[PDB]
Ligand binder design. Structure first.
Ligand SMILES: [Ca+2]
Ligand SMILES: [Ca+2]
Ligand SMILES: [Mg+2]
Ligand SMILES: [Mg+2]
Lengths: 485, 121
């Protein structure tokens, strides 16, 4: 008998698997209160924080031998090494000034944490770049590179934030330029920039606090606490304040509260807080100035700033009588100071005419002062006052008054130079005192165009009733101011 | 004043400068990756089963490593690692089944051979 055949030798197969992991990263951008500000808006000088985060390292990994984060930072973002180090325990921090790049390397300690249990996934830790944004109208973008064991590398998402002062901002549709405005207006609201302004007239300066670009701002509380001020550096050599007439309204036409007003003879007279604010804003007023202050920065911010609601300040200022004696120009300029950041308004210039009445003999001829063309305010008073000896000279009761320039009325009527104007005047005579006042009727003076020059002269008929010398004094009053001689 | 940005700033008036070449390149490459972190699942049970198979006279062939590829999260990796462990466990059981069946067939064969030999004796 033959033997059975042995069982066939069988074959088996086996194989191993390969597997690998690419942990994700995420760069976050936050304000100084750790509020997410990606694609929003924060004030110039805001602390901006960059958190360079990494997803969990996987179970079954090899030991991690290096864990490195490299962050090329944005231009205008000022790196803070000490705050960054303080915010980034577990990392060694280094910085390249040439390329504005910060590098974080996990310390041996941090790696030991990552390496403690290779059989389970482990959460990473993250560094935080701390710095400040230094420019108006700027967009600060940022991402970073993670490299693990010099064998795995990945670049993060790009985060950003923008500062106010940039038009066509796709993240912030209300963003535009920060441009405080100053305009000079008369009592009827006509713009009088560049015009002649008579001594005793009021400049109803109008100041715009330009807040619209700040709408939906996401600045931190420390930044907001730097407050909100408005400065009018007024020409104190020419003007006196009528601070009692100040009015502050918002862009919806509502009265503003919580804004106080003060004025100071100079910086040195001002409190320390104001000197500090002005210093930090780079503003040095010349001599005297007026300052408007948000009493409660938080409330002001919530009410007008984050809402983008402009304010309008009316600050009336009167031309001193002395300016009518000297003549001269004066300039006004304002500043808004938001979150400690100053911005200068345009400058507004006006000039004051030197009014020069003259006395002549032909009849005393009292030549009135000239109101130049292109002046800013209605004429309401134009008087001739003559104090005569009466010893002396005897008033007959006859006087006449004439136009000395072509006078244009509000309806385009012209009174030609030389035209008698006596009918538009009255006269008060004190023969015992030896004084006479010739007054133009107010309604007539107010009918004169503010574009028009104005001038008149009086002839006062005198019979001499004595011998010797009789000093004669003639004073011309124009609106609120007297002018001698 | 105001010539740098259009905002008449009286402090910190400078415009933001050009981005560094480093930031531009890094941002243009957002999301890009190089390499990966390899992860391992222990093979010792599978190796022991193949060794035992060889020792029993079974023919053993190792096939090429199967590349499961790359995953983006630790949680996916843990899932795939579990699949691998389960695959190793099944591979090992199959090998072990074959080896036991071989050992039994061989035992049975020799027993028969002993009967036949005793007859021919
Ligand atoms: Ca604006
Ligand atoms: Ca001043
Ligand atoms: Mg500024
Ligand atoms: Mg002015």
């Amino acid at each position: 008998q033959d033997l059975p055949t042995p069982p066939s030798v069988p074959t088996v197969h086996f194989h191993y698997f390969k597997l690998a992991v690419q942990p994700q990263v995420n760069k976050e951008i936050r304000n100084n209160n750790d509020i997410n500000i990606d694609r929003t808006l924060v004030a110039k000088q805001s602390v901006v924080k960059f958190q360079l985060k990494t997803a969990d390292l996987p179970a079954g990994r090899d030991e991690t031998t290096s864990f490195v984060l490299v962050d090329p930072l944005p231009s205008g973002y000022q790196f803070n090494p000490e705050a960054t180090k303080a915010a980034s325990p577990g990392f060694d921090v280094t910085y390249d000034n040439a390329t504005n790049t910060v590098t974080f390397k996990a310390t041996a300690a941090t790696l030991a944490t990552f390496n403690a249990d290779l059989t389970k996934s482990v959460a990473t830790i993250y560094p935080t770049v701390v710095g400040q944004v230094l420019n108006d109208g700027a967009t600060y973008k940022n991402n970073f590179t993670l490299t693990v064991n010099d064998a795995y590398g990945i670049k993060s998402n790009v985060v950003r934030v923008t500062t106010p002062g940039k038009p066509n901002d796709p993240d912030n549709p209300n963003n535009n330029y920060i441009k405080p405005t100053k305009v000079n207006k008369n009592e009827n609201g006509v713009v009088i920039d560049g015009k002649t302004v008579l001594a005793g007239s009021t400049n109803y300066y109008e100041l715009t606090w330009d807040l619209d670009q700040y709408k939906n701002d996401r600045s931190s509380a420390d930044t907001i606490q730097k407050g909100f001020y408005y400065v009018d550096d007024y020409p104190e050599e020419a003007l006196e304040l009528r601070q009692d007439l100040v009015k502050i309204t918002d862009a919806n036409g509502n009265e503003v509260t919580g804004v106080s007003v003060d004025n100071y003879t100079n910086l040195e007279a001002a409190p320390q807080e104001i000197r500090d604010v002005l210093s930090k804003a780079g503003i040095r007023p010349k001599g005297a100035f007026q300052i408007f202050r948000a009493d409660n920065p938080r409330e002001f911010y919530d009410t007008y700033v984050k809402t983008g609601i402009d304010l309008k300040i009316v600050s009336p200022m009167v031309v001193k009588k002395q300016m009518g004696q000297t003549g001269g120009s004066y300039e006004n300029q304002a500043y808004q100071i938001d979150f400690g950041n100053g911005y200068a308004s345009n400058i507004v210039i006006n000039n004051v005419p030197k009014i020069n009445p003259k006395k002549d003999v032909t009849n005393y001829r009292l030549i009135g002062g000239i109101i130049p063309a292109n002046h800013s305010e209605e004429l309401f008073k134009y008087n001739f006052y003559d104090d005569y000896d009466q010893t002396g000279d005897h008033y007959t009761g006859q006087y006449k008054v004439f136009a000395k320039v072509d006078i244009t009325l509000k309806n385009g009527v012209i009174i030609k130079s030389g035209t008698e104007l006596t009918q538009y005047t009255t006269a008060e005579v004190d023969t015992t005192k030896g004084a006479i006042t010739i007054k133009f009727k107010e309604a007539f003076l107010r009918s004169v165009s503010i574009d028009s020059a104005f001038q008149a002269e009086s002839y006062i008929q005198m019979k001499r009733i004595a011998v010797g010398t009789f000093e004669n004094t003639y004073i011309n009053t124009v609106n609120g101011v007297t002018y001698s001689s | 004043v105001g010539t740098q940005t259009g905002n008449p700033a009286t402090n910190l008036p400078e415009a933001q400068g050009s981005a560094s070449k480093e930031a531009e390149q890094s941002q243009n490459q957002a999301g890009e990756t190089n390499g990966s972190i390899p992860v391992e699942v222990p093979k010792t049970d599978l190796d022991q089963a193949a060794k035992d198979a060889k020792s029993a006279g079974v023919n053993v062939v190792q096939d090429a490593d199967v590349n499961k590829g790359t995953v983006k999260t630790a949680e996916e990796a843990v899932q795939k690692e579990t699949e691998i462990k389960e695959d190793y466990t099944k591979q090992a059981e199959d090998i072990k089944k074959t080896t036991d069946q071989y050992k039994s067939d061989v035992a049975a064969h020799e027993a028969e051979v002993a009967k036949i030999k005793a007859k021919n004796q």
